[PDB]
């Protein structure tokens, strides 16, 4: 069984490289962040440009939706995160306290907290309602590439250029587990599986790995793509067949069979590094986004 993703829309409008695309949980929007300091909102199904959200003073590396699809948080090189009301476009809060670029962000399922990772090598946990920093974790000894809550909000997984993935107890901020791989390649991305049992981790040696983190055991590895230079997002695609999806530095979208690790599709058409992919929560739809020589977002649709 293999998917058949085909290009359906190309979304242009960002004026520098795109950094991140995410589908709203209610399925109807795509948000995109860019080095052009902007967030844009698009219709998930027809690619209709909806709006631009502005106010960060420098570029944005990541953006994330609240559970109810009403808010976004963005992480910027201006050392802040910003919480936005999606419908109004207004900045509700500015989260200050990181001392360097903010690289990554996520809401917990409750969407009462935001977690962020920074070039300042820390992970911060923030109160959505007040915008105040609740915890600062000395999580790593190099820039933090990714942060993600598990399914119940009780855990955070972080990844860093120091080569480590760490699992943190959200409520206490204390480290529950460190995963080290073999030869400590920088870990450029990490996120829990939907069922909360695994973490999917990208390392800058052209490798994705599926780990059982309680056991500290690698269960699957995925290769064949080029990932040595950028922190490229990776996804569990669960709407049809169970795939692993990732951008690649060869301008392609790679899709792997989660179980057999075989490449099942390569999506051609971006003309620069595919820095970000996202999988639609209910339809077999992939959003992909590329760097400076492309600066567009592409939406692909499959029957499975």
């Amino acid at each position: 069984v293999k998917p058949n993703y085909a290009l359906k829309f190309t979304l242009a409008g960002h004026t520098k490289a795109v950094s991140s695309v995410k589908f709203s949980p209610n399925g109807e929007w795509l948000a995109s962040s860019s080095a052009d300091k902007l967030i844009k909102i698009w219709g998930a199904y027809d690619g209709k440009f909806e709006k631009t959200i502005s106010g960060h003073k420098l570029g944005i590396s990541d953006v994330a939706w609240s559970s109810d699809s009403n808010l976004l948080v963005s992480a910027s090189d201006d050392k802040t995160l910003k919480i936005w009301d999606v419908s109004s476009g207004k900045c509700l809060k500015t989260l200050k306290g990181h001392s360097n670029y903010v690289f990554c962000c996520n809401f917990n399922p409750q969407s009462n907290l935001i977690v962020s990772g920074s070039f300042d090598e820390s992970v911060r946990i923030w109160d959505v309602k007040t915008g105040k920093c609740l915890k600062t974790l000395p999580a790593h000894s190099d820039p933090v590439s990714a942060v993600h809550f598990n399914r119940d909000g009780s855990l955070i997984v972080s990844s860093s250029y120091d080569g480590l993935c760490r699992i943190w107890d959200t409520a206490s901020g204390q480290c529950l587990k460190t995963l080290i791989d073999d030869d400590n390649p920088p870990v450029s991305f990490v996120k829990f599986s939907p069922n909360g049992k695994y973490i999917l981790a990208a390392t800058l040696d052209n490798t994705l790995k599926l780990w059982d983190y309680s056991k500290g055991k690698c269960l699957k590895t995925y290769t064949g793509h080029k990932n040595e230079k950028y922190c490229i997002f990776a996804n569990f695609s669960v709407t049809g067949g169970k795939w692993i999806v990732s951008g690649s530095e060869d301008n392609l979208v790679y899709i792997w069979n989660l179980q057999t690790k075989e490449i099942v599709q390569k999506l051609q058409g971006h003309t620069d590094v595919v820095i970000s992919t996202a999988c639609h929560p209910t339809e077999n739809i992939i959003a992909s986004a590329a760097l400076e020589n492309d600066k567009t977002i592409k939406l692909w649709k499959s029957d499975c």
């Binding site: 950094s19 991140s20 590396s61 090189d77 670029y101 690289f103 820095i275 760097l291």
Partner: peptide, 6 residues
């Protein structure tokens, strides 16, 4: 920036 590699 995520869009830069150094």
């Amino acid at each position: 920036m995520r869009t830069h590699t150094d």
